[PDB]
Amino acid sequence: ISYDQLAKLSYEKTLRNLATQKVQKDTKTGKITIADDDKLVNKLAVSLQSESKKRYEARKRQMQNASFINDKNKQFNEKLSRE
Amino acid sequence: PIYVKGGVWTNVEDQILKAAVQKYGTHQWSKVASLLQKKTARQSELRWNEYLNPKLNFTEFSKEEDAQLLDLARELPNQWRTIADMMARPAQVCVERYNRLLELEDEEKEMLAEARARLLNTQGKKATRKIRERMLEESKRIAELQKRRELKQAGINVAIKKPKKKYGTDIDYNEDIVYEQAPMPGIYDTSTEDRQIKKKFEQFERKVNRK
Amino acid sequence: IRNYPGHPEGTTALKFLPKTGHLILSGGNDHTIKIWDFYHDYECLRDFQGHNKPIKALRFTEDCQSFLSSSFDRSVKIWDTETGKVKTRLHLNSTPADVESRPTNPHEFIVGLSNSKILHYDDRVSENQGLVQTYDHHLSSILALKYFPDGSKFISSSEDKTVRIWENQINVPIKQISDTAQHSMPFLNVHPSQNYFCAQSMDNRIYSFSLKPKYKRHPKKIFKGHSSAGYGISLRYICSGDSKSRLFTWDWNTSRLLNNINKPITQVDWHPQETSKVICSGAAGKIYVC
RNA sequence: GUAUGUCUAAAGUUAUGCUCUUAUUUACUAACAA
RNA sequence: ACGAAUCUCUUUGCCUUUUGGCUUAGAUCAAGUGUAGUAUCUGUUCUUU
């Protein structure tokens, strides 16, 4: 799977996470003030943190699963064994 | 006592050698030898080549294989290394088969402990020294803090001494921004956001002060 | 359990009298040494100091007649118990962070400095304005010293994470301690055999040391779980306080017991004439007794 | 014994299962002695 | 039963602390003691759990 597909497929996913539940320009300054809902941005912030948190804890679990000497080697032998 | 090396391969010793081989590989025979207090480099390497290496085989020969062997003997007279290679076996074993066809613990535990210690210690002295200095440095820092904190409790405010800057252009990063590469100029307006973040920052500082 | 407001300014240095000790000596951060008793009727006899800075390390002699005192303005002062008119040491290089007198003869008297040079002062030698001999085998500020209780051997840890068993006056390290640990407060457990020299660390873990012989130093079991910026004292039990919250009683045999609330600060001590009574030293006139 | 690298070298910036006792090994280290 | 959300696991995908040069393998593999330290040994006794 390429990063082309994995992007669109992850795009499709977070659209399902959405599916759960004005422009004003001063052309002299060039400042395009898009006044939008402050509640929705907060809902993005919390959701995005939660998504990253979910992933963060996902590694933590997978790190705590278990012919080596030190932390790295064990994993390096695991990088060899997967092949 | 110092002495001339040799003897016989105790199973523990063999295991140790195997471990070493896994660690250091098949061409650093000195180090592996060193790991074994009894056995030499040459001895070790020979052993690995002859007995210990897993990509050898000691399974019995099929009738066809027997034929191949004895035929080789008939044709290549006692050039047993060559013969071994032809067979695809180690040579001593082949020879033995051919012949057949024709008719204390404290010390050991010491080296073990030492061995395991070594194998689980895989850094040059520079590394070890560096980590030592790091932990020492940390300790020093905490001691300094304890003094400073103690004085604060006592009522004397002491600012923490800077790191004695190594060179003229050495940087303290809390003075001012590291190399403020600013964001790309604003297409969408950013003013309210700037304010809010500023407030958040100042608030955080306040919290820290109170903390 | 029960309180007493002593020193309104933060830091304190609470200590009982020796063995047969009915008294509660304090000397806080408010540059004033004060005196209160174990009898609930807390009676105030204020030993006023003269020197400008706050008073830091206060300890008694074996006699219970004169107590030493250290401040930040290079000033150590000896103090007679009830009267308080007594020999004085106005002049030093800079603050001695910790000081202790001999547990067998009140005459000999060690002061330990920030410059890492330790100083004797006998009774006739305090009259001389001299030293029996200095020590200079610690290089960092020492802030920490206490005698092996027979009077002879003498220990002083330091800011560089090193402890030093000495003979009383020899000025030659019997033993420098290991490096990778850290140490702050040195206190000998009232150990029945009297083998043990305990000491608090920076890294939340009080240690134990076989002080007889002085060359012995293998810790048996370490007392973990007291986020340390403070102090600790023994009698069965060792009780030490932490930086953040509250005090910690610990079974000296197994290293685990109750964790009593303090209210911050932490300097624990035991009323040794009794079996079960503690003093906590909170910051800013919050001394708790049990 | 060195390169080398840290350290010190004084003036106050105006806030409210264990403990123990020992004896033995081995290793490493040691400009300390032989 | 279909739709959705939450949780756990399994299969795959992602390698997520996952080897960062070159030379003659870069070169050569020892004969030590006592004194001290340090650690590590092992025994050794007793205590109480």
Three-state SS string over chain B comes to: CCCCCCCCCCHHHHHHHHHHHHHHCCCCHHHHHHHCCCCCHHHHHHHHHHHHCCCCCCCCCCHHHHHHHHHHHHHCCCCHHHHHHHHCCCHHHHHHHHHHHHCCHHHHHHHHHHHHHHHCCCCCHHHHHHHHHHHHHHHHHHHHHHHHHHHHHHCCCCCCCCCCCCCCCCCCCCCCCCCCCCCCCCCCCCHHHHHHHHHHHHHHHHHHHHC
Count of alpha carbons within 13 angstroms of residue B131, beta-carbon side: 6
Residue type, A80: L
Task: Give me the helices (H) in chain C, please.
Answer: 123-128
C32: number of Cβ within 10 Å: 17
The CA-CA-CA angle for residues C128, C130, C134, to 5°, reads 160
Determine the Cα–Cα distance for residues C271 and A50; give it in Å rounded to an integer.
Answer: 54
C149, containing H or E segment: none
Chains B, C: CB pairs < 8 Å: 46
A16: number of Cβ within 10 Å: 8
CB C21 within 8 A of CB C64: yes
Determine the Cα–Cα distance for residues C288 and C290; give it in Å rounded to an integer.
Answer: 7
Distance, Å, A40 CA → D16 C1': 42
Beta bridge partners of C67: C60, C79
* B164 closest-nt by C1' vs CA: D6
Nearest Cα neighbor of C28 from C39, C41, C44, C147 is: C44
C260, containing H or E segment: none
C117: number of Cβ within 10 Å: 17
Nucleotides of D under 7 A from a protein CB: 6-8, 12, 15, 18-22, 26
| B107 Cβ contacts chain D strand, under 7 Å | no
Determine the Cα–Cα distance for residues B150 and C184; give it in Å rounded to an integer.
Answer: 12
CB C34 within 8 A of CB C47: yes
CA distances from C265 to B32, C2, C233 (A): 56, 17, 15
The CA-CA-CA angle for residues C254, C258, C264, to 5°, reads 120
> Structure resolution in Å?
3.8
Distance, Å, C191 CA → D20 C1': 12
CB C49 within 8 A of CB C77: yes
- Note if the bond before C213 is cis, omega within 30 degrees: yes
A19 touches chain B (CB under 8 A): no
Determine the Cα–Cα distance for residues C43 and A62; give it in Å rounded to an integer.
Answer: 64
3-state secondary structure of C91: coil
CB C3 within 8 A of CB C257: no
How many residues appear in chain A?
Answer: 83
Nearest Cα neighbor of C98 from C57, C62, C67 is: C57
N-terminal to C-terminal alpha carbon distance within chain C: 6
Please give the residue range of the domain that contains residue C242: 1-290
Determine the Cα–Cα distance for residues B17 and B28; give it in Å rounded to an integer.
Answer: 12
The CA-CA-CA angle for residues C27, C29, C35, to 5°, reads 20
3-state secondary structure of C7: coil
Nearest Cα neighbor of C164 from C150, C144, C191, C193 is: C144
CB C266 within 8 A of CB C230: yes
CB C119 within 8 A of CB C113: yes
Query: For chain A, how many structural domains are there in total?
Result: 1
Tokens of C55: 């008073």
Please give the residue range of the domain that contains residue A35: 1-83
B189 touches chain A (CB under 8 A): yes
Helix axis angle for B91-102 and B63-75, nearest 10°, is 90
Q: Is C108 exposed, middle or buried (0-12, 13-18, 19+ CB in 10 A)?
A: buried
Determine the Cα–Cα distance for residues B210 and C274; give it in Å rounded to an integer.
Answer: 41
Q: Which residues contact C241 (CB under 8 A, 6 or more apart)?
A: C226, C230, C231, C232, C247, C248, C262, C265, C266, C267, C268, C280, C281
Tokens of A20: 């759960």
Q: Is C200 exposed, middle or buried (0-12, 13-18, 19+ CB in 10 A)?
A: buried
B76: number of Cβ within 10 Å: 12
Q: What region, left, alpha or beta, does residue B34 occupy, with left being phi > 0 and alpha being psi -120 to 50 degrees?
A: alpha
Q: Which residue has the tokens 């560089």?
A: C160
Tokens of C127: 């009259």
Determine the Cα–Cα distance for residues C200 and C156; give it in Å rounded to an integer.
Answer: 13
Give how far B58 is from chain A: nearest CA, Å. 24
Q: Which residues contact C44 (CB under 8 A, 6 or more apart)?
A: C34, C35, C36
B180: number of Cβ within 10 Å: 6
* Residue A69 DSSP label: S
CB B19 within 8 A of CB B119: yes
Tokens of A83: 């092949």
Nearest Cα neighbor of C198 from C179, C223, C174 is: C223
Tokens of C208: 């134990």
**Which of B132, B139, B141, B144 best tests the C interface by mutation, with the highest count of C CBs <10 A?**
B139
* C216 closest-nt by C1' vs CA: E38
Tell me the pairing of strands C66-71 and C76-80. antiparallel
C249, containing H or E segment: strand C247-251
3-state secondary structure of A59: helix
B35: number of Cβ within 10 Å: 21
CB contact under 8 A, C180 and B135: yes
Rg (C-alpha) for chain B, rounded Å, is 34
3-state secondary structure of C208: strand
3-state secondary structure of C105: coil
Sheet holding C237-241, edge to edge: C232-234, C237-241, C247-251
**In B, which residues are within 8 Å of C203 by CB distance?**
142
Query: For chain C, how many structural domains are there in total?
Result: 1
Give how far C275 is from chain B: nearest CA, Å. 32
CB C268 within 8 A of CB C241: yes
For A3, list phi and psi in degrees, rounded to 5. -75, -15
CA distances from C162 to C101, C157, C179 (A): 21, 6, 6
